[PDB]
């Protein structure tokens, strides 16, 4: 089953030099600090909070609408500060997501209506099924589904996730073409 068409009106999007397609309605905060590596899709009502720490995001990742990327807060012994958030290449974040993960690897897929606890670490090629909460300090190993409330390991992904996911994200970018201005 190929990725279906998903058209957008060209007026409320910004296409950048690197190829990032960031929606106008997305709430970018501290945009001087945010870094997108190109070919990124940030949909409407996305609250990317770069005003607290470095929020770097990899290539071809998709951040669906109404999703918040907020870097976590860590209380270390020497004092207090905000940990920078890092997201790898080819990450598919579904809508209505809440992300407080310290690190999200590459080839990751977060299900819709998901909340990720503070300072979580998501290794590469992991899935989180829909309507799932990951409490803080939860480490998802590669090739595992973390589902339920709380998210518990309840399966393993197929072998070819590194290939399937990079196909899916590329198809999503290639099929996210602007509406016909007729």
């Amino acid at each position: 089953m190929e990725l279906g068409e998903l058209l957008y009106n060209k007026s409320e999007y910004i296409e950048t030099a690197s190829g990032n397609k960031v929606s106008r309605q997305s709430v970018l905060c501290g945009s001087q600090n945010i870094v997108l590596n190109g070919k990124t899709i940030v949909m409407n009502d996305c609250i990317i909070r770069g005003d607290l720490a470095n929020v770097r995001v990899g290539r071809h990742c998709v951040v669906k609408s109404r999703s918040v990327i907020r870097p976590p807060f860590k209380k270390f012994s020497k004092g207090v500060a905000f940990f920078p958030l890092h997201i790898g290449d080819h990450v598919f974040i579904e809508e209505d997501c809440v992300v407080n993960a310290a690190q999200i690897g590459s080839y990751v897929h977060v299900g819709k209506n998901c909340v990720i606890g503070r300072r979580c670490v998501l290794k590469d090629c992991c899935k989180i099924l829909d309507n799932t909460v990951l409490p803080p300090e939860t480490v998802v190993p590669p090739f595992t589904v973390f589902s339920g409330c709380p998210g518990l390991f309840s399966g393993e992904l197929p072998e070819c996730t590194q290939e399937l996911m990079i196909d899916v994200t590329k198809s999503y970018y290639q099929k996210f073409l602007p509406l016909t201005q007729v």
Binding site: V27, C29, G30, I47, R49, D51, L52, V68, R70, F73, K75, V80, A81, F82, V98, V115, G117, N131, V133, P135, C149
Partner: protein, 178 residues
């Protein structure tokens, strides 16, 4: 006039939507896109109650009946101190005690009363109404699973650090003196 006068030291951002005759304490922080709508009556918020992101606090008149009870029916919402309102929280409780944190994506019922030290877990709903006992943690989406806790825990250092970093990036609402 929906008086938005706030005590000094508040770091509410202009992006954070606040409507109605609100009242917020000195040290309270409010993040961008926080919604504080006060249509039924004024909202009183004490010091230190930090509001995060998609926090929709509506003092909405009860549409379940809407009998025009006591004409206006002000019912001011009083919120305690050293509280936390995480991302996606949907709070409607009229009274809230000090040292109250509600995790992300939580529903609080209109008729609920939140006492001191209580914690609401993420992806939980409190449509049912009753007074919450002290230091009660409500966890789980399948059910509520109320569990007694030994003590509360505030987040003052995070609030202080937010006070440092926020006004440099975002323009806080330049509220005049109350």
């Amino acid at each position: 006039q929906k008086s938005v006068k706030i005590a000094p030291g508040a770091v509410v951002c202009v992006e954070s939507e606040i409507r109605g005759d609100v009242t917020i304490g000195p040290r309270t922080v409010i993040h961008p896109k926080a919604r504080i709508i006060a249509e039924a009556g004024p909202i009183v918020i004490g010091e230190g109650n930090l509001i995060e992101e998609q926090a929709l606090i509506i003092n909405a008149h009860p549409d379940n009946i809407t009998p025009d009870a006591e004409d206006s029916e002000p019912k001011p919402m009083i919120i305690g101190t050293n509280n936390v309102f995480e991302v996606g929280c949907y709070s409607q409780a009229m009274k809230m005690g000090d040292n109250n944190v509600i995790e992300s994506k939580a529903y609080v019922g209109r008729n609920v009363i939140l006492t001191s030290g209580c914690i609401i877990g993420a992806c939980c709903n409190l449509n049912t109404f009753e007074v919450i006992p002290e230091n009660t943690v409500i966890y789980g989406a399948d059910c509520l699973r109320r569990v007694q806790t030994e003590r509360p825990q505030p987040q003052t250092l995070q609030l202080d650090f937010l006070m440092k970093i926020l006004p440099n990036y975002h323009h806080l609402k330049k509220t005049m003196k109350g």
